[model samples]
Target: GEWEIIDIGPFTQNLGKFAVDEENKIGQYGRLTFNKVIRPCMKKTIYENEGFREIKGYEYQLYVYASDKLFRADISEDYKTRGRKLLRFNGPVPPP
Candidate 1:
């Protein structure tokens, strides 16, 4: 029901920065969230919690040619809304 950004550690090209809702609990199963980041990258959900099922793997979408160039000159355009799979993980871990 709330929102916050958390550092998710080493991603594809850069460290992950996950946009999450801390209270996104879904009954006994677990919490759910749409994975988002400031930079383009990918990650895996690997963790455990009481009565919670593991999450299916997923990745983040990125802006088109938004890195270092004329396109990169525009920070406003660097951030755009797109779509990504739901994230169902718990706790946290060190970089892989």
Candidate 2:
């Protein structure tokens, strides 16, 4: 956390981030994160993307998702976790 003087007392911030763990597999689901950016705010920005990671020599799940707020998918036969579900993403879309 950080402290700053906002004229009177002080302003405290609990800054931190949410990153995917090496062994994490948020394929079909996912969180309560704490630290900095305190209180978070009443607004959220959802996200989604797509890539072929789970399937070998084939396309990965079509599902789209995230906590900020999102989604996409294709559920024909092999079903890539699609169908109005928040389980897909555009991998390596260049993180800002």
Candidate 3:
């Protein structure tokens, strides 16, 4: 939700500060750097060379410039939730 520079360098600056709640439960934080603010093209290359098929069901596409290269990340429709199985796919996936 925000951005900041906690540390500094001659050429560039280092990143965000984390915040915790009164009960010491986790709250807000800024792990996001300026570079992590990614935008994906409607038509982009996939590492699998499948040609953007994954873009169909998923909603968000996260991009990165790391190790001096460009990369793409696939995300689910409910990106906020992880480690949970989908109750249905289009309709349902029969349990084995």
Candidate 4:
């Protein structure tokens, strides 16, 4: 699936791209600056508060400059398909 840049800034320059598997509602940021290609930790390294937020259905998380200053990317699930209900089983065993 295609990925859209939900948020960006000078800090974003370090991260060249954002990729996501919409089907799983998970994603990762890949850096393409210099030779230090490392994806930062998803959460704080220690017992510090982790950053997280929500907007209309978009979920954003992770830290920025050791605080919740920047939008570290957000994931959104399509309600149309996400709320799909399972159809009842129609096997012969049920009719017994």
Best-to-worst TM-score order: 3, 1, 4, 2
Question: Can you write out model 1's per-residue Cα lDDT over 1-96, one digit (the tens) per residue?
Answer: 112233434442231112233223333223433333333233334223444544332344222121121111011111123333323333332222
* lDDT at position 15, candidate 2: 10
- Cα-based TM-score, every candidate: 0.21, 0.16, 0.25, 0.18
Query: Largest lDDT belongs to which candidate?
Result: 1
Per-residue alpha-carbon lDDT of model 2 for 1-96, expressed as tens digits? 122222211121211122221102453334422222222122122222345343311121221223432222211122244322222333322222
| lDDT tens readout by residue for model 3, 1-90 | 112222222221111011011111221222222332123322222232366443223222233333233334332332233222212111
| lDDT agreement of model 4 with the native | 0.25
Q: Which stretches of candidate 3 lie over 4 Å from their true place?
A: 1-35, 41-58, 77-96
- Candidate 2 segments whose C-alpha is farther than 4 A from its true place: 1-56, 72-96
Separate clash counts for every candidate: 0, 16, 0, 0
Among these predictions, the greatest TM-score belongs to: 3
Write the number of the candidate with greater lDDT, choosing between 2 and 4: 4
Per-residue alpha-carbon lDDT of candidate 4 for residues 1-96, written as tens digits (9 for 90 to 100): 222334444433233222112211221223211221123423111121344422112222222221111223322333334422211211112111
